[PDB]
Amino acid sequence: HMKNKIVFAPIGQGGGNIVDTLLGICGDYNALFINTSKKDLDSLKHAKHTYHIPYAEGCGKERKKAVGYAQTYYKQIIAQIMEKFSSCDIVIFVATMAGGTGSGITPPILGLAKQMYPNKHFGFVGVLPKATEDIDEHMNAIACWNDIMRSTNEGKDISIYLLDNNKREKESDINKEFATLFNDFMNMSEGVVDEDEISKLLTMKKSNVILEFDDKEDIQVALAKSLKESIFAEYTTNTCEFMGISTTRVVDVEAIKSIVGYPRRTFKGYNSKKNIVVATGIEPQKTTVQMMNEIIEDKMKQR
Ligand SMILES: Nc1nc2c(ncn2[C@@H]2O[C@H](COP(=O)(O)OP(=O)(O)O)[C@@H](O)[C@H]2O)c(=O)[nH]1
Ligand code: NA
């Protein structure tokens, strides 16, 4: 259905882990696993389709060697995706940003795919490193972000799911939680948020965030705890474009808007299992990303 409309393009070990985790939850998705490391690809649990960059191996967080291996295979990689999954409207790229092949190869491949196939929708799921990681790791994530900004009109051309490894102790938890959040998002159509409404949310440009909250505490309090604990990178703006809401019981939607952010269009529905809010079209969290430059400059001066 909506899930078969989506094809993931995980690039690198971390991005491969996330999509693999998601497929473990639900195999209704499509994915082409891209990596310089044949080892990582062979070690995947649920990869039916993989693409090993020829004559390549793991790049040990060196993004310019990743490009070295990949640059000549960019088009065929895109050929693989678009012609094997020709009936997929939405191509979501998934990559960690501090790595070598995820960080260095995703922005050229994404940017090129945009130009070759203009009428498909493109998403980017990126993962910000922990603050304790070193200069190179942060320099890689800055370079990754900037390459995508420069290739997508500052995030305006694509959907952005921005994740923060600082928000959890284990990277695996980030993997599990996002995989859960995205699939719950996709299952909102089970008064219901319809598929076209889910489609609108999913394909909305700029930065998207998915939130779930409990029905114990007050809803303003309950959403506040979700925002604070969100695996997504923090946003400082107070508006968004489209908002999806699917809850177990009747809720004050305006309270949700005051806490999560004010949308110009809302889709509301009900489900029997989760209380989920999706904010889409949030301005790309450049402020949160800018902090990496602060880490770089503070770690640099330590030397
Ligand atoms: N959330 C999450 N982050 C990861 C994972 N693996 C790696 N990372 C992050 O990405 C960086 C290493 O990227 P990795 O994907 O292993 O390198 P790549 O294969 O060259 O893209 C580390 O600094 C981590 O911050 C993962 O499985 N989950
Ligand atoms: Na499912």
Side-chain angles (χ1 to χ4, degrees), residues 20-200:
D20 196 33
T21 295
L22 174 54
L23 285 175
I25 296 187
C26 178
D28 296 347
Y29 299 97
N30 301 285
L32 180 62
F33 288 80
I34 310 162
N35 208 332
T36 62
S37 176
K38 185 174 181 179
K39 188 212 340 129
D40 295 338
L41 295 169
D42 291 341
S43 186
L44 292 156
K45 262 213 61 181
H46 310 106
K48 288 190 184 180
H49 307 104
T50 57
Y51 183 92
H52 174 248
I53 303 182
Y55 308 97
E57 220 51 65
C59 297
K61 298 174 178 179
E62 186 66 50
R63 69 192 306 263
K64 226 93 172 161
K65 244 204 198 320
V67 177
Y69 288 117
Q71 67 187 330
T72 51
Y73 296 101
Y74 285 169
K75 186 184 291 180
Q76 167 140 1
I77 287 177
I78 293 175
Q80 293 259 335
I81 304 173
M82 301 299 172
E83 294 302 320
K84 174 57 189 173
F85 310 88
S86 48
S87 56
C88 283
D89 253 23
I90 312 164
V91 180
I92 307 178
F93 288 89
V94 189
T96 57
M97 301 169 68
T101 77
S103 175
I105 307 180
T106 304
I109 288 194
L110 169 56
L112 177 53
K114 279 183 49 196
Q115 306 296 334
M116 298 183 66
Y117 303 85
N119 290 321
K120 287 189 177 303
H121 314 267
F122 293 93
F124 175 67
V125 176
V127 190
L128 303 169
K130 289 178 182 290
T132 47
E133 305 192 34
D134 292 282
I135 296 167
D136 285 349
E137 285 87 340
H138 280 80
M139 293 210 74
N140 281 1
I142 290 291
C144 186
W145 176 262
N146 287 341
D147 283 333
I148 298 199
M149 290 299 105
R150 131 190 50 255
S151 286
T152 61
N153 199 244
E154 313 303 317
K156 289 184 184 178
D157 286 9
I158 66 166
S159 296
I160 299 176
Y161 299 84
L162 196 57
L163 304 175
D164 193 353
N165 275 359
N166 289 277
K167 302 307 292 291
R168 289 298 183 278
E169 37 286 29
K170 292 204 236 63
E171 298 170 356
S172 64
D173 287 329
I174 297 280
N175 300 2
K176 299 173 182 178
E177 202 157 330
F178 170 79
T180 301
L181 287 173
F182 190 89
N183 190 65
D184 288 350
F185 174 29
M186 290 294 111
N187 284 341
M188 285 172 65
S189 56
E190 311 314 287
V192 160
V193 181
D194 325 279
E195 263 190 333
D196 55 320
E197 295 181 319
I198 291 183
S199 191
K200 282 296 185 181

Side-chain angles (χ1 to χ4, degrees), residues 204-222:
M204 165 57 64
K205 311 296 185 57
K206 300 197 236 66
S207 189
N208 303 346
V209 173
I210 311 172
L211 302 161
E212 292 184 12
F213 64 100
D214 73 326
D215 44 41
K216 302 292 184 291
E217 290 170 271
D218 183 281
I219 184 169
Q220 272 189 75
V221 177

